[PDB]
Design a protein around this ligand. Structure first.
Ligand SMILES: Cc1ncc(C[n+]2csc(CCOP(=O)(O)OP(=O)(O)O)c2C)c(N)n1
Ligand SMILES: Cc1ncc(C[n+]2csc(CCOP(=O)(O)OP(=O)(O)O)c2C)c(N)n1
Ligand SMILES: Cc1ncc(C[n+]2csc(CCOP(=O)(O)OP(=O)(O)O)c2C)c(N)n1
Ligand SMILES: [Ca+2]
Ligand SMILES: [Ca+2]
Ligand SMILES: [Ca+2]
Ligand SMILES: [Ca+2]
Ligand SMILES: [Ca+2]
Ligand SMILES: [Ca+2]
Ligand SMILES: [Ca+2]
Ligand SMILES: [Ca+2]
Ligand SMILES: [Ca+2]
Ligand SMILES: [Mg+2]
Ligand SMILES: [Mg+2]
Ligand SMILES: [Mg+2]
Ligand SMILES: [Mg+2]
Ligand SMILES: [Mg+2]
Ligand SMILES: [Mg+2]
Ligand SMILES: [Mg+2]
Ligand SMILES: [Mg+2]
Lengths: 524, 524, 524
C-alpha cells in the first residue's frame, strides 16, 4: 500500500471523514484520488478553513481534520489557532511541504523549520523524517489532538511522501483506542464528596470543558443536589448550563476583585472545566475572600498549575461530573430561586438597541437554536437575554480573537443540521473572516448571520473612555455595506433598520432554505 | 514580605527542604539569608548537581529543587536533563538571570532567550515578567514538575527580583494541593478487567513508572492473580518487580522483532508504566504477531500517542495498578515457574569477568541494597544476577546519557540513608561526572562506587564489530587511575585485580563509614 | 559515491582535517572508515570536547569540527556552546541521530526535536529531511559557522544516512568559496576617516574580534597614527593589543558609570570588534558623558542593534582595521606615555599572592607564551602583570562559563605547537572540565596548567561581601588534591607552596616534554 492509501484508511478507521481545506501544490499529491467516502469543504482563506473546522469539532465533540498550504497557509490560520488552543479544540492541522529533494535549497513553497511555525499554539508539532513514518505521525497527531486536554496539533508532510510505499506494519495503527476518560481515585473522591456534602453554602462555577464533555446535565443534577448557585466562568467560550434553570446566576465578570466579592460567603466553591480564572480587565484585589475555599476540576495540567488559589484535580470532565453528580447527598437546603427576567429597554421606531435584538431573537428563534457571539460590546446583555436550554448552544472566540464566529457558525451548522445556527457578529468583527460566507453559499449551509452595525469598534471606544485615553486612532469603521458583501459571496441579504424590519427579516431568514445575512442598524 | 521570603515559604509549604546547586553571582541574592531549615548540597559541575538531585527525586518519589547559574550552568546540565525527561523525574530547575536593567544590553551573565535554552527537555520553561510574579511562577513550576507525567521544569529569575515586595495575595499559593491521582472510569475499567479475566495466556510488561509510583507490590498481586509472566520493558531505567519472583522473566531485549517473538502466543499483553516500546537496536519485523492484543496503561499522553500498536489508557500508574490488582479474578491456571539461577562463568585467578562481579555483589550486598548501572556492556548479566526483592533497587540512565549513575548514586544514598547504594560504573562512563565524588566526600554520603575497568568503551567496540565497522577511532580509554581520582576528591579508594581482592575490598567497603571507590580490573 | 565519502571529501576540500569527538552508536556509521588523512581527538566528556575544539578554532582562526552523541552528548556540551556563541567561535557541531525508521517511536538514543536542543546558542541548527541532503546540509553548516559573525552551528544526522547514495551533483559543494571580507563603502569610509582625523582627543577600544581577525597590528598602526590611548573592552575574551605598547591602557572595568567616566573628555571613541559593552556588575549611570561621541565597528548585527549609544558599522574587522590604519592621517599630537610597571606586592615565605604568581610567570615564560585565564578573582591583576606582545596570547571564557580554559588550553596548544600554553585556573573552575586533562596526556599536548588553590569560590565570597549578603551556602571547596587528579589522568604533577617552589616547579614544567599541572597554594 502507498502512504496515501494507508493514511486515508487510518483517518477513516479513526472516524475522520471530512477534510476542511484550502489547497495548494504541495497538497495535490495528498488530495488526488480523494476518497469517495470523504467530503472536502473548501474555504477561501485559511482563517476561515480553521474556523469552520473548529466550529465543527466543538459542536460534534470529535476531532476535525484540516489541510493547508505550506507556511503561508499555516500562517494565515495562526489567529484561528490561538482561539482553538484556548477552547481545547481537537484539530488535526496538516500542511504540505516541498518535495524532500528541494527542501535544502529552500525552493519556493518550502516551509522552513516547519514544526516551529505554529508553536506555541499547538499541543504537538512535527515533520516526519521519512515517508514511511507519515502514517505513524498521523496516528500521533490524531491521538494528541483527542486526548485530554484536547487541542490543535500540526503535521507537515513533504509532497513526495504520499506515493511511497507504506510500512505494512502500519496496519496496527488503524484500530488503536486511546482513552483519557479518567477520574479521581475512590479514596480521594470520597474526601471531595464529603467536603461538598459538608459545605454550608456551596457555589459552582462551570467552564467550557463542561459543554465540550456534554457534562451539562450532570452538572444540573449536581447543582440541584447541592442546592447551589451556578455561574459560568469568565470570558466564556461555551455555555455549560441551562440559562433559565433556577440555580443559574449568569456570566461571572472577568475581574479578580469582582469574582472574590461574588464568591464571598460561599465556603466551598467548586470550579469544573474552567481555568481559574480567565480574567480580562485589570481589577486588582483578593483572589478569594477569607472563608472561601476553592476546588478546581480541570482537564488541563497547565490550568491546574497556574491557578493562583485553590486545590485542583486533573481529570476528564465528563467522568468527574458524572461521578460527583451521582455521589453527593441531596441537601435539605432550599433550591436557589431563579433570576428574574431582564428589563425591556425602551425602544423607539429607529435604530435597534442590542437588548432589543437579543430579546427578539429569544422570542423568534427555535428553542434548540445555537448562537455564536462576536458582538464584543454586547456580551453581557446577550447572556442575560437568551434562554439556552440545551448543550452546545453558545460559542464565543476563546482567545478573544476576532474572525472566529462567522466561519465557526458554518462549521457548527454543518455539525448540527437540525439546529438553527444564528451568529451575532459586530460590523468590525465581520470583516476578519468575511470570505467564509462563500462556503455557506457553496455547500448550502443555512447559517443565519446577524450583523450588528454601529459603525465602530464599540468596545474599544468604551475602554478608551474608561482609560481616559484621548486621541486614539482607528476605532471607527464607517462605509461597509454588508448586504453587498453577502451578495459578493452569494448569500441572501436582508436589512433591518428598525424593530418591525428586524422581525420581518428574522421571519424570512428562519424560513429560508440557505444561509442569510441580516444587516441590523444598531445604536451607536 | 519580600519575593525571597515568600518563595522560600512556598517551597517549605510544598515540602521542599533541600537545594541542589552550583552557585553564581546571579544566584547570590536568592541564596543569601538561606533558611536554617533548608539544606544546600553543593556539587562542582552542573551535570553532577542535576544527577544528584535526579537520584534524590527518583528514590524519594518527590520533587527535587535545583539552582544553577544562568545559561552556562543550565547548559552544563542539559545532558542530565535528557535523562530526567525520559525518567519522568520531577525536577524544579531554577537559574539566575541578570538584573532586569542589564538584560537588554546583554551584559555578561545574561541568559538570552532563557526559556528556550532547555527546550525540548522540559515540561515547562519560563521567565517571569515581573518580580511579584516570581512566587506564582515558582508555584507553577512545582506543580508542573509534580503532575503526571512528572518531569523537569525550568524557571529563570532576574537577580534583582528577590528583594522586591511580593504580592500579599501570594499566600494563596502556599497550601495548594494538586492531584493527578486518577484512574479509568468504572464502566471502561470493568471492560478492561473482563478482558484480563478472559485472557487464556496473558503477559505483563512493566516499566519505570511502576517503580516511581511504588506500584510494585500491586503489580505482584496482579501477576499472581492472572498467573502471568512478567517482563521489564526494554531499556529499563528502574526495576518494577522482584527479580526472583516466580513470574519474573527479566529484561526484554530492545528490538521490534525480538519483542513480538517473545510475546507470540500471549493473547493479551498488559503494559503498565512503560513506553511502547523503548527499542534501541535496529531489529525490524512485526510489532506484534497475529493473535496478540496489547493494552497499555501509561501516565504520559506522549507515550500513548506514539505507540505503534495497541490500545492505551492515560492515567496514574499507582491508582491503576491498585485498582486492577484488587479487581481481577484469581485465575485457576498454574503460577509460572521461577527462572533458574544463572550459570557460574569459569573464573581464573586473574581479571574479573563481569558475571563474577555481579554474583559476588549479590552474595555480599545487603538484601535491601540499591544498585545503579552505568556499565554499558554488562547490563543483561546484571539483570540476571542481582536478586532485587524491594522497590527502588535499580537505576540506569533513562535516555542512555552517561554521567548519570555516579552523581545519582549520591542522591539516592542521601534519599535512602539506611539502604546501601552500590553504583556499578564502567571506566568510560565514570569520567563524565567524575567530580560528583567530591559531594559524597564533603557530606559523607556513603555510596560505594564499583568501577569496571576494562580500558575501553566496550559496548561501542562490540557494536562496531556487529556493524562490521572498521577503523573507528576513539574507542579506547587507557591510562586512567581511578584510585588517584578518588583520592583527588577525598574518597577512600581500593583496588580489586582478582576475585580474592574483590571480596576483600567489598568487605571493607560495606563496613566503611564514608563513600568508597573500588577499581575492579575486568576482562577486556 | 556514498554520503559518507562525499561528506568527508567536502570537509577535506573545505580545509577540515580534525574531528574533536566523544563517540556513540549513532556516530559509528560516520566514524567508520575514518579517513587516514584526518585526525580524531577524543575527550572523555562533551564539555571537554567542545572546549578543546573551541580553543583550537580560536587560535587557528579557522573552523573546528565536532562530533557528539545524540541529545545527551549535545546537552553535556551546551555550557561550552554558551561560551562559543559569545566568542564568535566557528564550530561545526554534528550529532548522530537514530536511524530514520526508529525516530517516530522515539527509540532510545533518538534526539527529539533535535534542532531546537542547542537553540538559542547556535547560528544555525538543522536536521536534513533525507540522506542525500546531508552533504548540502554539511556545506551550509561549514559556511554558516565561518561567515561573519562567526559562531557555532548544529547538524543532526540519522545514522543510516551515511551509507546511502549521495547526489552526484554534490560535487559542486566541494570548492565553494564564501566571503564576508567586506568594509564600508568609500564615501562613508571617507566620512569616518575625516571624523577620526578631526578628533581632538580620540580613544580606541578593542574587543575580541580584533584578535580573531589578527587585526592587532593594524590596530597598533591606527593607535600610533591617531596618538590615541587604547583600552580593551570589558569582560575580554581575548587580547587585541600588545600590553606594553605605550598607548595601552588595560582592561576596561565592566560597568556603565565606570566606562563613561573613563571616556570623559574623549571627543570620539572608536570601538572595534567588541560589543558596546559587555558590562557585568551593576554600576548605573550615564552611558557616555556629554562631549563624547562613540562609533562602533562590529562584525555582528546583533551587537550593532543592541548598543545603547553611538553609531555602528557592521563589517569585517580585518578589512576595516586595515583600511582605517592605512587611511588616517599621522596626528602631530604626542604619543601616549606607557603605563608604569605595576607594584610588587610584599610576599613572605608562605602562600602565594596571585600577583606574585603572575609576576613570576611573566618573568619565566617565553615571550610568545599563550595564557588562558579561569582564575576569576584575579583577572585585573593578570591583565596588569603579563606582557603579551603577540596576537593570540590570551583567552578567557567569553560567556563567563567555567569549564572553558582547561580544555581550551589543550586545543590552543594543539593549534600552536611552538608557543607554550599556560592556563591559570582557580581550584573551583578546575573541576568543571577536569577530565580534559586525559586528552593532553593521551596525545602528549604539552599544556601547563597552573591551579590557583585558595580553597574557595573566591570571587563569589567577594561579591557576597559587597552585596552584604550573609549566610550564603556553597562557596567553599575544601579537600581537593589536584596532584592526585592529575595522576588520575596521567599528567605530571607538581606543587608550589611558596615562591621558591613556584620557581622550581615552573622551571621543571617549562622544560617538560608533556603536559604538567602545578598546584599553587594561594592566599585565601
Ligand atoms: C484578530 C483581532 N484583532 C483585533 C482585536 C481587537 N478587538 C477586540 S474587540 C474589537 C472591536 C470589535 O468591534 P465590533 O465587532 O464591531 O463589536 P462592538 O465592539 O462594536 O460591539 C477589536 C478590534 C481582536 N480581539 N482580535
Ligand atoms: C553523554 C554520552 N556520551 C557518549 C555516549 C555514548 N556511549 C554509550 S556506551 C559508551 C561506552 C561506555 O563505556 P564504559 O562505561 O567503559 O562501559 P563498557 O561499554 O566498557 O561496559 C559510550 C561512550 C553516551 N551514551 N552518553
Ligand atoms: C558553569 C558555571 N557555573 C558556575 C559559575 C559561577 N562562578 C563564577 S566565578 C566562580 C568561582 C570560581 O572559583 P575559582 O575558579 O576557584 O576562582 P576564584 O574566584 O577563587 O579566583 C563561580 C562558581 C559559572 N560562571 N559558570
Ligand atoms: Ca420576550
Ligand atoms: Ca452531526
Ligand atoms: Ca461595532
Ligand atoms: Ca551466588
Ligand atoms: Ca529519605
Ligand atoms: Ca569500559
Ligand atoms: Ca618582573
Ligand atoms: Ca597550527
Ligand atoms: Ca578559588
Ligand atoms: Mg512560531
Ligand atoms: Mg507506513
Ligand atoms: Mg480507585
Ligand atoms: Mg534549546
Ligand atoms: Mg508575589
Ligand atoms: Mg466512574
Ligand atoms: Mg548528496
Ligand atoms: Mg565603494
Amino acid at each position: 500500500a502507498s502512504v496515501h492509501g494507508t493514511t486515508y484508511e487510518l483517518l477513516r478507521r479513526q472516524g475522520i471523514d471530512t477534510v476542511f481545506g484550502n489547497p495548494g501544490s504541495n497538497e495535490l499529491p495528498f488530495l488526488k484520488d480523494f476518497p469517495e467516502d470523504f467530503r472536502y469543504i473548501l474555504a477561501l482563506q485559511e482563517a476561515c478553513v480553521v474556523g469552520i473546522a473548529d466550529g465543527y469539532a466543538q459542536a460534534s465533540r470529535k476531532p476535525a481534520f484540516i489541510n493547508l498550504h505550506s507556511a503561508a497557509g499555516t500562517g494565515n490560520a495562526m489567529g484561528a489557532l490561538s482561539n482553538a488552543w484556548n477552547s481545547h479544540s481537537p484539530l488535526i492541522v496538516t500542511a504540505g511541504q516541498q518535495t524532500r529533494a528541494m527542501i535544502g535549497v529552500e525552493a519556493l513553497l518550502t516551509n522552513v523549520d516547519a514544526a516551529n511555525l505554529p508553536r506555541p499554539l499547538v499541543k504537538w508539532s512535527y515533520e516526519p523524517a521519512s515517508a514511511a513514518e507519515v502514517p505513524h505521525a498521523m496516528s500521533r497527531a490524531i491521538h494528541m489532538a483527542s486526548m485530554a486536554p484536547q487541542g490543535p496539533v500540526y503535521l507537515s508532510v513533504p509532497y513526495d511522501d504520499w506515493d511511497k510505499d507504506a510500512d505494512p506494519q502500519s496496519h496496527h495503527l488503524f484500530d488503536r483506542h486511546v482513552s483519557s476518560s479518567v477520574r479521581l481515585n475512590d479514596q480521594d473522591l470520597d474526601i471531595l464528596v464529603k467536603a461538598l456534602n459538608s459545605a454550608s453554602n456551596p457555589a459552582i462555577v462551570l467552564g467550557p470543558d463542561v459543554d465540550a464533555a456534554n457534562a451539562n446535565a450532570d452538572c444540573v443534577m449536581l447543582a440541584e443536589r447541592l442546592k447551589a448557585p451556578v455561574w459560568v466562568a469568565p470570558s466564556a467560550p461555551r455555555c455549560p448550563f441551562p440559562t433559565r434553570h433556577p440555580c443559574f446566576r449568569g456570566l461571572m465578570p472577568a475581574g479578580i476583585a469582582a469574582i472574590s466579592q461574588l464568591l464571598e460567603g460561599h465556603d466551598v466553591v467548586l470550579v469544573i472545566g474552567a481555568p481559574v480564572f480567565r480574567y480580562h480587565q485589570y481589577d486588582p484585589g483578593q483572589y478569594l475572600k477569607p472563608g472561601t475555599r476553592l476546588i478546581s476540576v480541570t482537564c488541563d495540567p497547565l490550568e491546574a498549575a497556574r491557578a493562583p488559589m485553590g486545590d485542583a484535580i486533573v481529570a476528564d470532565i465528563g467522568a468527574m461530573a458524572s461521578a460527583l453528580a451521582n455521589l453527593v447527598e441531596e441537601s435539605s437546603r432550599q433550591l436557589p430561586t431563579a433570576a428574574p427576567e431582564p428589563a425591556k429597554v425602551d425602544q423607539d421606531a429607529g435604530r435597534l438597541h442590542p437588548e432589543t435584538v437579543f430579546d427578539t431573537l429569544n422570542d423568534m428563534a427555535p428553542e434548540n437554536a445555537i448562537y455564536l457571539n462576536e458582538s464584543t460590546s454586547t456580551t453581557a446583555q446577550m447572556w442575560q437575554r437568551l434562554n439556552m436550554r440545551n448543550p452546545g448552544s453558545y460559542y464565543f472566540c476563546a482567545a478573544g480573537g476576532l474572525g472566529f464566529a462567522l466561519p465557526a457558525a458554518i462549521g457548527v451548522q454543518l455539525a448540527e443540521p437540525e439546529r438553527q445556527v444564528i451568529a451575532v457578529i459586530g460590523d468590525g468583527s465581520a470583516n476578519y473572516s468575511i470570505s467564509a460566507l462563500w462556503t455557506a453559499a457553496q455547500y448550502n449551509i443555512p447559517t443565519i448571520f446577524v450583523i450588528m452595525n454601529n459603525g465602530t469598534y464599540g468596545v474599544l471606544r468604551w475602554i478608551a473612555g474608561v482609560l481616559e485615553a484621548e486621541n486614539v486612532p482607528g476605532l471607527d469603521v464607517p462605509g461597509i455595506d454588508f448586504r453587498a458583501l453577502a451578495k459578493g459571496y452569494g448569500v441572501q441579504a436582508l436589512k433591518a433598520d428598525n424593530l418591525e424590519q428586524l422581525k420581518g427579516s428574522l421571519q424570512e431568514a428562519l424560513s429560508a432554505k440557505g444561509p442569510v445575512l441580516i444587516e441590523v442598524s444598531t445604536v451607536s
